[PDB]
Design a protein around this ligand. Structure first.
Ligand code: CLA
Ligand code: CLA
Ligand code: CLA
Ligand code: CLA
Ligand code: CLA
Ligand code: CLA
Ligand code: CLA
Ligand code: CLA
Ligand SMILES: CC(/C=C/C=C(C)/C=C/[C@@]12O[C@]1(C)C[C@@H](O)CC2(C)C)=C\C=C\C=C(C)\C=C\C=C(C)\C=C\[C@@]12O[C@]1(C)C[C@@H](O)CC2(C)C
Ligand SMILES: CC(=C/C=C\C=C(C)\C=C\C=C(C)\C=C\[C@@]12O[C@]1(C)C[C@@H](O)CC2(C)C)/C=C/C=C(C)/C=C/[C@@]12O[C@]1(C)C[C@@H](O)CC2(C)C
Lengths: 42, 152, 203, 197
């Protein structure tokens, strides 16, 4: 378990997990709000 | 209004462009059966286009002569939401990221071989460091005032 | 050492001794090599066992009583669809706050074994538990059946753990049976008991 | 002193000497003593103003709902016409606050330096701690005991939270605070935030 956790903390794996999470969040945000060109909340 | 620009609800080329897009979509829509899924998808596309044009008209942008919206980066109070507010948001996010990275680097600099910590990140320390970026402007201002920001 | 194991004739893992209640040496994936992982897994298993026991009881008692003419409760699968005196969001928020207080207390107990044994408001009331996961006290052990000889305590803990495992299996079986077949679990049991051969999963 | 979160060790820099100490600093802001002093003064001022603000936007609404004096709401209090234009009042406030805040800043930088009156030289403030001038500022001669400071800090924190709630719940719902509370009390289970949207 220690060695598996150490391997999971290597740079490419952490990078791909972080970027997958970011891409998913961005895609979901763009799906909920389809188009956006200016900031209209104010 | 500004630099000879017309409000986007008044302009006629905007409505002309909307008409062309709707006609182009309906040209392909006419092929499939009414009950088929492609017809539903194309109807959803048409509704999305109409909603987008309505929102663009509502938000008060200024289309030019060609009929496309233009952005004003002067700082005029009527057009602060086009550039200035997203700029502030981006600056906040970038400062957060930079502060978190610099804090992690300084934290791991103490050990004997920081290179092995860079190539193999440690998760608990980074998790502790990450949430301190929510208050990055205050910490940066105080560190600048003290004199810990710039190396000597 | 000589206790029965899950696979007779095999070698139990070194990190599984047998002192823990309900220990049979079943850990082929090595998910609890680290002692801290062992503590966390034990706490999670205990919580899961208790919650699933409550869930299995609350699923299978009203359905059986509805099979008889005593009760008229609806199906457990459609319970959330019905209407109540408040919106589901408000009930969810109130439940979230209420359960969150207790879960924070339990988390504080897990992190530090002896920091939440006293009533914050009145310092007179105390909790008499001395083991993590077994709060004890008058609130969670009014009858006093908890404290006792180590052998009796281990036997009771093993009974509870086995019942909880069976309950977890029961709840997942009920969920999968309802989604696949489309009828109440008691109906499935009666139909299978009527015709043991043909009335099975292969139908 | 007390622990904000049970089971969590208090930060090493917070030793409990300061009044209103509970070890609440998860983000590590007050890791330097100078930052600690500056933030102590800032927390005093932000909150000493907040109590007055909350009272000003709360009490008149209650007294008007009773039916004694008809006063405009706190959001609409700026539209009403007064004996002078808003610009003149703003300029006067700017000048006076400039003077008093520069005096306070000079007190903070060098303690015990601006105690002396600049015009009538015979009057001076008695020596004391920073942030608690005393003297003329304490006309009733109340002892600055630690318990009073703790009560003041707790009241200030509550007032800050109340002001934030006022602002947010008036932005979301166009009505005022007291009418919002009355509406919630009319039917508690169908008037919370989650009921709206
Ligand atoms: C750790 C954070 C970090 C920080 C705070 C800085 C800071 C800075 N960079 Mg450097 N840089 C970094 C990483 C970082 N860099 C990396 C990874 C590279 C290689 C791609 C470079 C290559 C680089 C160049 C080529 C230049 C700078 C320059 C600058 C300066 C101006 C800002 C700017 O132009 O951005 C420029 C930013 C980029 C080109 C990319 C950096 C953003 C990366 C993708 C993210 C870093 C995040 C990191 C992975 C976080 C890990 C922490 C986590 C484990 C907890 C400023 C001192 C400029 C300069 O010299 O100004 C005087 C410049 O010319 N940087
Ligand atoms: C619900 C979660 C759960 C959890 C956390 C545990 C946890 C534990 N078990 Mg228990 N156990 C469970 C349910 C669970 N059990 C069930 C349902 C049974 C009956 C089959 C048993 C029977 C059992 C035996 C016979 C033994 C243990 C033992 C242990 C301990 C060491 C093994 C371990 O590291 O597990 C950690 C486990 C996990 C992290 C859970 C998730 C694992 C993956 C992600 C799940 C894959 C899902 C699953 C395969 C899908 C099934 C679908 C469903 C419809 C059936 C530890 C306290 C050993 C012991 O020492 O006893 C004290 C041992 O000998 N358990
Ligand atoms: C482990 C957790 C657990 C959970 C989350 C639930 C969850 C629920 N229970 Mg179940 N239940 C459990 C364990 C659990 N039960 C156990 C161990 C038993 C055995 C005693 C039961 C026996 C049971 C009964 C006999 C009833 C429920 C009902 C309910 C449902 C709504 C009522 C409510 O929750 O108030 C807490 C619920 C109870 C503990 C019993 C009190 C009955 C409540 C107040 C509802 C009465 C409303 C009425 C029947 C509906 C119409 C009103 C009328 C004016 C028109 C909901 C699905 C009710 C239902 O079926 O609604 C759809 C209900 O009648 N449960
Ligand atoms: C299914 C059988 C079962 C059994 C044998 C046990 C056994 C035990 N429990 Mg557990 N427990 C269970 C289910 C069970 N529990 C469930 C469903 C929950 C969720 C509410 C809990 C939550 C729980 C808590 C919060 C605590 C315990 C503790 C204890 C210990 C002493 C209390 C006791 O008198 O229990 C004997 C139980 C029975 C005789 C079972 C029959 C009762 C029937 C169903 C009555 C109908 C109601 C003992 C190891 C206490 C402890 O260890 O403190 C020192 C403790 O604080 N249990
Ligand atoms: C926990 C006990 C348990 C019990 C008592 C039952 C009982 C029943 N199930 Mg099964 N089932 C279970 C677990 C259980 N199930 C689980 C966890 C799942 C999810 C994978 C299923 C999924 C399932 C489906 C999808 C269907 C049934 C069906 C049925 C009935 C016919 C038997 C059959 O065809 O085999 C099917 C059995 C399974 C796919 C796997 C069961 C094996 C698990 C590991 C049992 C372990 C329990 C224990 C050791 C055995 C005796 C229990 C006793 C001590 C109380 C029977 C009443 C069929 C039905 O509707 O009958 C008409 C049906 O269509 N079951
Ligand atoms: C902390 C700063 C503060 C500020 C800036 C204001 C500001 C204001 N007050 Mg409020 N007020 C405050 C605290 C404050 N109040 C407190 C502590 C109380 C005691 C409960 C009141 C009670 C109060 C009354 C009774 C009245 C005002 C009114 C006014 C307005 C006229 C200003 C004036 O004539 O002098 C102005 C919007 C007057 C008004 O016309 O309101 C619109 C008025 O009638 N205020
Ligand atoms: C009610 C909360 C409150 C409390 C308990 C204190 C407590 C204290 N203050 Mg602070 N203070 C407050 C609010 C409060 N203050 C506000 C709002 C301001 C800004 C005007 C200040 C500004 C301030 C100064 C400038 C000074 C103090 C000092 C003191 C100390 C001695 C005086 C005293 O005992 O007050 C006890 C107070 C009361 C019993 C409150 C009675 C209720 C009043 C009358 C309410 C009227 C409000 C209503 C809405 C109209 C003591 C630590 C003095 C000191 O430390 O000198 C060494 C001093 O120099 N305070
Ligand atoms: C300091 C204590 C405090 C108190 C006692 C209240 C009290 C009230 N609020 Mg306000 N509120 C507060 C602070 C507070 N608020 C803060 C800090 C915010 C910003 C997040 C808000 C934002 C807010 C909204 C958006 C709404 C209310 C509304 C209400 C009422 C319904 C309560 C509710 O639905 O939960 C709301 C609870 C919170 C947002 C957080 C918990 C409050 C503090 C932190 C708990 C201690 C109630 C009279 C509702 C109303 O208008 O009724 C008609 C409503 O829609 N409040
Ligand atoms: C000053 C203030 C309000 C002042 C209001 C005033 C003057 C109002 C004036 C008026 O109303 C009147 C009287 C009458 C009206 O007619 C006119 C106006 C003009 C409208 C609020 C401060 C409000 C201040 C607030 C809410 C501050 C909140 C801070 C928090 C929660 C910080 C938390 C943490 O920093 C800690 C403590 C430790 C870290 O480790 C972690 C984090 C989380 C970073
Ligand atoms: C908590 C839980 C678990 C279930 C079910 C949980 C199950 C089946 C868990 C199974 C785990 C397994 C098999 C793990 C196996 C292994 O990990 C080991 C042990 C060791 C490794 O070496 C090998 C592998 C294989 C990885 C279930 C809880 C259910 C609840 C509260 C239900 C509540 C309700 O019903 C009520 C009362 C009334 C309804 O109206 C509403 C709902 C809400 C529906």
């Amino acid at each position: 378990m220690r060695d598996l956790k150490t391997y999971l903390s290597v740079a490419p794996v952490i990078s791909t997990l972080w970027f997958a999470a970011l891409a998913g969040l961005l895609i979901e945000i763009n799906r909920l709000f389809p188009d956006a060109l200016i900031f209209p909340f104010f | 209004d500004i630099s000879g620009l017309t409000p986007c609800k008044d302009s006629k080329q905007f409505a002309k462009r909307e008409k062309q897009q709707i006609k182009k979509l309906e040209s392909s829509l006419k092929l499939y059966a009414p009950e088929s899924a492609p017809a539903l998808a194309l109807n959803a596309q048409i509704e999305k286009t109409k909603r987008r044009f309505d929102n663009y008209g509502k938000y008060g942008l200024l289309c030019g002569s060609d009929g496309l919206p233009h952005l004003i980066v002067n700082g005029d109070q009527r057009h602060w939401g086009e550039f200035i507010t997203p700029g502030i948001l981006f600056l906040y996010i970038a400062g957060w990221i930079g502060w978190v990275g610099r804090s992690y680097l300084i934290a791991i600099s103490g050990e004997k071989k920081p290179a092995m910590k860079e190539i193999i990140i440690d998760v608990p320390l980074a998790s502790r460091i990450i949430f301190r970026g929510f208050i990055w402007p205050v910490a940066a201002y105080r560190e600048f005032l003290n004199g810990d920001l710039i190396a000597k | 050492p000589d206790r029965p194991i899950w696979f007779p004739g095999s070698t139990p893992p070194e990190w599984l001794d047998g002192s823990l209640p309900g220990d049979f040496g079943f850990d082929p994936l090595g998910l609890s090599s680290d002692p801290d992982s062992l503590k966390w897994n034990v706490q999670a298993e205990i919580v899961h066992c208790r919650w699933a026991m409550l869930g299995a009881a609350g699923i299978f008692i009203p359905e059986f009583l509805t099979k008889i003419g005593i009760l008229n409760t609806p199906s457990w699968y459609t319970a959330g669809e019905q209407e109540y005196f408040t919106d589901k969001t408000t009930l969810f928020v109130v439940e979230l706050i209420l359960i969150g207080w207790a879960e924070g207390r339990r988390w504080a107990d897990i992190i530090k074994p002896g920091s939440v044994n006293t009533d914050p408001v009145f310092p007179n009331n105390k909790l008499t538990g001395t083991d993590v996961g077994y709060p004890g006290g008058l609130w969670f052990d009014p009858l006093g059946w908890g404290s006792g000889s180590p052998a009796k305590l281990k036997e009771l803990r093993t009974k509870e753990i086995k019942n909880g495992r069976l309950a977890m299996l029961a709840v997942m079986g009920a969920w999968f049976q309802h989604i696949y077949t489309g009828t109440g679990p008691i109906d499935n049991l009666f139909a299978h008991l009527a015709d043991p051969g043909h009335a099975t999963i292969f139908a | 002193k007390g622990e904000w979160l049970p089971g969590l060790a208090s930060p090493d820099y917070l030793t409990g000497s300061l009044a209103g100490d509970n070890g609440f600093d998860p983000l590590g802001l007050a890791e330097d003593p100078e930052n600690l002093k500056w933030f102590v003064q800032a927390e005093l001022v932000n909150g000493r103003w907040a109590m007055l603000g909350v009272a000003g936007m709360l009490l008149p609404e209650v007294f008007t709902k009773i039916g004694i004096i008809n006063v405009p709401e706190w959001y609409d209090a700026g539209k009403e016409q007064y004996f002078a234009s808003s610009s003149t009042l703003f300029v006067i406030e700017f000048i006076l606050f400039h003077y008093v805040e520069i005096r306070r800043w000079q007190d903070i930088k060098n303690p015990g330096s601006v105690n002396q009156d600049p015009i009538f030289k015979q009057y001076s403030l008695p020596k004391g701690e920073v942030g608690y001038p005393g003297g003329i500022f304490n006309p009733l001669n109340f002892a600055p005991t630690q318990e009073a400071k703790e009560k003041e800090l707790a009241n200030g924190r509550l007032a800050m939270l109340a002001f934030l709630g006022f602002v947010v719940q008036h932005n979301v719902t166009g009505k005022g605070p007291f009418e919002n509370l009355l509406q919630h009390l009319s039917d508690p289970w169908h008037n919370t935030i989650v009921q709206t949207f």
